[PDB]
Design an enzyme around this catalytic site. Sequence first.
Site, mmCIF file in Angstrom:
data_model
loop_
_atom_site.group_PDB
_atom_site.id
_atom_site.type_symbol
_atom_site.label_atom_id
_atom_site.label_comp_id
_atom_site.label_asym_id
_atom_site.label_seq_id
_atom_site.Cartn_x
_atom_site.Cartn_y
_atom_site.Cartn_z
ATOM 1 N N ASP A 56 -3.279 9.110 3.763
ATOM 2 C CA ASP A 56 -2.862 8.630 2.434
ATOM 3 C C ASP A 56 -3.741 9.126 1.265
ATOM 4 O O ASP A 56 -3.374 8.989 0.073
ATOM 5 C CB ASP A 56 -2.883 7.095 2.401
ATOM 6 C CG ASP A 56 -1.653 6.445 3.072
ATOM 7 O OD1 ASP A 56 -1.795 5.254 3.460
ATOM 8 O OD2 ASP A 56 -0.555 7.081 3.181
HETATM 9 O O1 LIG Z 1 -2.324 1.784 0.129
HETATM 10 C C1 LIG Z 1 -3.210 1.828 1.261
HETATM 11 C C2 LIG Z 1 -4.168 3.046 1.356
HETATM 12 O O2 LIG Z 1 -5.158 2.921 0.339
HETATM 13 C C3 LIG Z 1 -6.219 3.849 0.218
HETATM 14 O O3 LIG Z 1 -6.976 3.398 -0.897
HETATM 15 C C4 LIG Z 1 -7.032 3.863 1.515
HETATM 16 O O4 LIG Z 1 -7.966 4.927 1.450
HETATM 17 C C5 LIG Z 1 -6.093 4.036 2.711
HETATM 18 O O5 LIG Z 1 -6.773 3.971 3.949
HETATM 19 C C6 LIG Z 1 -4.891 3.082 2.700
HETATM 20 O O6 LIG Z 1 -3.972 3.472 3.710
#
Ligand SMILES: OC[C@H]1O[C@@H](O)[C@H](O)[C@@H](O)[C@@H]1O
Lengths: 822, 822
Positions: B490
């Site tokens: 992500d």
């Molecule tokens: O929306 C969720 C995503 O947010 C990011 O800030 C994190 O690094 C991720 O691990 C997470 O999956």
Amino acid sequence: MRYGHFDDAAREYVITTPHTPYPWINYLGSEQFFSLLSHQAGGYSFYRDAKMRRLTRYRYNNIPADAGGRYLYVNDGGDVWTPSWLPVKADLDHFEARHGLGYSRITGERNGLKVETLFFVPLGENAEVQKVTVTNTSDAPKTATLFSFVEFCLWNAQDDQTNYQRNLSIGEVEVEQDGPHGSAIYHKTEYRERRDHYAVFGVNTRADGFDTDRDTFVGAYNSLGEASVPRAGKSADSVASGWYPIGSHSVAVTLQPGESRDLVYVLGYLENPDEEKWADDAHQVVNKAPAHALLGRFATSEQVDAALEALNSYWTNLLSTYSVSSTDEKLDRMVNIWNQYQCMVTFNMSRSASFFETGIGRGMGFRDSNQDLLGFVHLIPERARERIIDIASTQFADGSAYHQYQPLTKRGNNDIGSGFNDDPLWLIAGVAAYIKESGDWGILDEPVPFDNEPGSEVPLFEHLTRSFQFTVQNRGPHGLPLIGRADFNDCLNLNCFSTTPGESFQTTENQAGGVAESVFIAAQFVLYGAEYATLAERRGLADVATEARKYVDEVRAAVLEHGWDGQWFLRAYDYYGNPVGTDAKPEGKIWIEPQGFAVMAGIGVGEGPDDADAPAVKALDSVNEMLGTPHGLVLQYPAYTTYQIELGEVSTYPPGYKENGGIFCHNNPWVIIAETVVGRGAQAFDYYKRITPAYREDISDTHKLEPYVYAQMIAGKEAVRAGEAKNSWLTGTAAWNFVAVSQYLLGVRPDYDGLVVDPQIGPDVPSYTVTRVARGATYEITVTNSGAPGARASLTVDGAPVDGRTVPYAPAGSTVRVEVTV
Amino acid sequence: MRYGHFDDAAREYVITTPHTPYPWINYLGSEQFFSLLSHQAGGYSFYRDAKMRRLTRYRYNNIPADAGGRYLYVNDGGDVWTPSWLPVKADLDHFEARHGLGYSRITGERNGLKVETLFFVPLGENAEVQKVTVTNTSDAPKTATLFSFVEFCLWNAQDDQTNYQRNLSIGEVEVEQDGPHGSAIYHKTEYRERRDHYAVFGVNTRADGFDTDRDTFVGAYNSLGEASVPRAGKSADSVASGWYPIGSHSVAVTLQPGESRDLVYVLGYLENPDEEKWADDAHQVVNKAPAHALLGRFATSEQVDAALEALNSYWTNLLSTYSVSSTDEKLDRMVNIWNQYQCMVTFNMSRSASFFETGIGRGMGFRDSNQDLLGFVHLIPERARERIIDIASTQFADGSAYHQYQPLTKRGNNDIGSGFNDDPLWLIAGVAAYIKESGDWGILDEPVPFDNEPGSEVPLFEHLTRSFQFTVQNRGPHGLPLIGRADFNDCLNLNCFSTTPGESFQTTENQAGGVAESVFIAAQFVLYGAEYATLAERRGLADVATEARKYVDEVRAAVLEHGWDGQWFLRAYDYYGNPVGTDAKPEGKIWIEPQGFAVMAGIGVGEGPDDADAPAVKALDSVNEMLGTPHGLVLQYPAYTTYQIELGEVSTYPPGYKENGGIFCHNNPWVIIAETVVGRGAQAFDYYKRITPAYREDISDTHKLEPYVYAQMIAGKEAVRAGEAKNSWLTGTAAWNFVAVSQYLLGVRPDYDGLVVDPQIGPDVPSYTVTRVARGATYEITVTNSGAPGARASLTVDGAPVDGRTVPYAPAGSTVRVEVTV
Ligand SMILES: OC[C@H]1O[C@@H](O)[C@H](O)[C@@H](O)[C@@H]1O
Ligand SMILES: OC[C@H]1O[C@@H](O)[C@H](O)[C@@H](O)[C@@H]1O
């Protein structure tokens, strides 16, 4: 029962116990940086925007309330206590908290050590300064260690409180024990990425140690009251990596009997230009220059005292525009100090951040900031001029507007809904008030964009025409304005019909169609439509003005024809075209808002106060009889006891709270003003006293909240908690009462071409003097007042008698002596 | 070193101290009602949706952590303590917390009174039941008063934490001291209006007294640990009106030496049909029939025991499908109990509500719930079926999908982003694993809407082709799939270029244009493209199947031609067509995801484990050399030390945390499986051990978090907290490790036409027996294992040797005996 007292000479409220019914807070700062400071040192600080740039963390609904603030643990021979009382709750020999204008002072003493902290936000600085004086009050020497403590928040308060999955891994600090003026800690979470700003927390001495990790400072399984480090008597020199960064320094002091030491702590907000972000080419170390400059400006007590004296002069200057001297010191302290001070705070905070507003969803309200201007214009009109431009800029071309804007960016949003049809008119309210006050007709020519779109600018005046026309072209089948999502009352949602829980009435989708109209907006329109007409005639826009007055006449004709129930004004017509606020329904028979406001618009006003047949008298008597409680006037009666699906949020409150039969204090000044309009000053003053901080100080245990500021609501006669307030500080009640007392009770109000002097306060204030600076001249207005109902004033000016109650504006620099007889 | 120990016969983790490194929780419930329960009784409960229907309040980032949950204050002779230790923290003679499958027991003994509480959610019930057993362990008669305590949440958790301006005036309760089975308290906030549900907190006895108002029970200025009522030894019988509603009963107990008593407490979630909400015509009294029924179902200890035995039986039956008996008891307990239990929790919760996910913004992830299936299909395939339909229904017609959906409504939303281009292929993953397990080919003909549109239904298989076609038609210049917002990482946001703080990368507006491509989505396309072709072949779609394999081939060729860096696979191409994860860059030279996943897809496989010419082998060796650590494999190497504006969120974390150099555990099992595909069983098993709870229990003080479940992230090599986990419980790590270990290491895996037995675990598990129920039949798999590198199995089945490693599925009711030599 009381918990402290006013000190008019020091312009302070003095709290004499920590054991208040509720945390009592002050606001520090009046420019771009702000602090909520409770009498126990609880709260937090932000720069410009409480959601987006919050410097320090605070927990709403903590157990206990308000455990969280700027603390100073004293370790004296192993005994640990805080002069704020919370969080340690060690027995104090003396305690006192003084809230003043832009500063507070908190003093606690235990076992021969007195610690006094002066807190404030200096002018021109984005920082909160503390000056701590430690005194040995025993007869033997003392050695104690002082541990300062603040908890950082990761800037975005919303993210801080919900996004741990990311944010527990991003906390970053730097520590500078041997800085140019003492030790500093730097909180720089996300400065490695898009943030060009960081926070410093520093002290004007080389500290013995520090801590920047919360868990290390407090200890596993401990609350703030049980913190390990101060108990251990020495700093753990913790360097945070993620988790919960804090700022904390220790300083050991040795004092002979009667001796004291000063310490200056600064929590500052700093920015760097992008290419000046980093000390080093690798971009690993923060450029500390603006933080060293800041610390250098509060390296000494002398520098602190000079700042505090400047802040005092700023306030004296601010308060020199409107003041009163009378036989009533409660009245006087409200008019001279507190209501004006509160008006500055509401102008700055709108409704975003208090101990009830969480500084997350709410930004600067369109309707809210316009109303606040009414109590702010005389204070600093150049800042009011700016705010009007900021507000009008969030307006749409069709004349509707964003309901609020984000303080950091000045851009509007729909986070608390859209399409409130009373919104557009408040813009006219705000500009009219500002022009009457300043005479700055050039503002009408200011180029002002719609929705901040570059290239869409038109003159401000044209935004007003948009506002006016919005209401003209949105009337229902009775000629009354369509209500849209809600009017001035946020909970009259007539286009809602929600049967789905969890979704907010404020943001939830509305039905297209139906015929829902507002009697309130009708009145609002008569009042501010007339003002618009007046501005049009002066811009030289004769047909426009003419046309505008035709529409005003029509709408007021409609109030009288279709908006009258028999003994009061109707409140509304629902989606279906049925009346709201009629004696024909069993609940919600009479609503307060159109009663106050239609009468201020002059609708149904008769021959005098004794004209039992005039609609205005009848309306006001019904408000007296059905809405009056010793705590003020309830919004409607009776309160709804079951959910009324056609009315939206209103019946969702248990009876007697908020909009369902609470005293929603901001609509009370309307009835007060109305009462002066019909010539019943006595009753108007009566209503003023029911809700006014200085007259309720005596029931502090009932009111519960701060006894020196207005609150949004006081539980009504139908509540088990009748008399107890919620949501203090941030409310349009402040500006509305100020307008009421300063302008209609005491009767001194600016008009376009002169200053109106029209007292109407009844016999409780038989004589008083008002000093009003208006358009650079001083008016000394000496009133002899019999308070006889319907008795209205006559004037002499510089010894010659004049006609009517308007004193044409003298030239800048003159002093004009008005003698008033009622 | 350790803070408790596994109990395999009991299927519990026994925590032998209150003083763990972090709060360690269980999840109670597996259907629609769920509880988070720390080993100190902290946490909360919700119905179906942790944000919309939260019964009880819990504070994240509290000081201290986890002061707040289900408390039982004991007052013995004025001494006040809690068997959960927190909040009162009185010294206990004995303490123990057992976390089991859907229940927990917490025991505290102090001065001759032992108090044990069994907590669980019964099957078929939306309630959390506690059975309290108080025993007098002294030699003399004893008396005490017990105060139960639970704090209500006002249902919407987001509102509960942010909207006090409204919600401090809506809390409403009912008190029922003399109910059919004992005393009960009703929490009925907003039942007045749109809510058809209320909560009950009741006990199977007529309580001495009660409290419903927090401030009265706790007292002003007090923490939970200093609650006034228990200290005074008498309830105040408080009837809440707004503010903070709680549930508490007092019960007086008397006990001869050696004697015990049981009390049963119930927290329940109840609904009424609209037409039966109210007991009275006036509509002020909640209809209590369902609550009386629920309290009747747990009126006695016997009813509790029977439900607890039904729960044990349910878990026995769930765990009967996959089991292992081996020489390694750590591997055994993982495979047999904990990893299956964890998969049940992730299937149910996705990533929404843990002690790190706050159960506000995250609902049911499209990608996460698809992957969770991989680990869950063998436990309850019927619910897996339903999940696939719920998920596929939030897909759009173009094959893209809502990134997550709201648990209560099953409606997709964008609250955490849009346009993650890896999302569509996960649908194929989930269905394939479902069909392999169950053989339910008829799910492909299930009619499924797009975006829940009435009338938009197509067969499920069409949804898969939409997914497949989305990728084929969204490739870039190198023949690799466009990445969009991000892929499975992500934080890799190549269309972002954000210079503006305070807006989530996840959620922030993305840039049009550019050529950003993902090597991960390429390897994902190659794997699941092939799975789709197979589904198409089975359905007779020879045209579609052939084209599909053609595309799979085009992409495979693209990865070898354009996504190979020399010693490992490339990661991405950025917006401007610059390679990401190449040795030509100083930072992020190698990224883990394409390495494990390309090889899982069979890209770059050669002649064997020792084919040093083969890309797969060069790739795995580099992973080992450059990414490996005693705690698992870090995501990339080296970490970014400066913000890389074109990579988006990844470089914003400090080195060694989360996506920037952390062990992001859910991508480790790909490398494990990859290592098995290539014949390096020893190395695969090693990696498995590095991140597995049972093998890390010996370093609890370093892992910090629960030693019995996988966590999302273990701080990596470049971080000062190397080895410390964050975000436990809710991670795809659980489904993926269960896949790795059950299917590729031990080697037992369902294919379309039979069960493959292909051990690849190397020499440290010389013999084991897997018991696998598949398609109605029981397979007994006896494995003798040399472990020789590259050595693969030959089978004999029911006494006869067979060709290859696929045992065709035998009829339902059979037991097949497979003898395996490696
Ligand atoms: O929306 C969720 C995503 O947010 C990011 O800030 C994190 O690094 C991720 O691990 C997470 O999956
Ligand atoms: O969004 C803000 C509004 O929320 C409503 O629920 C409250 O009752 C109003 O008084 C308030 O102004």
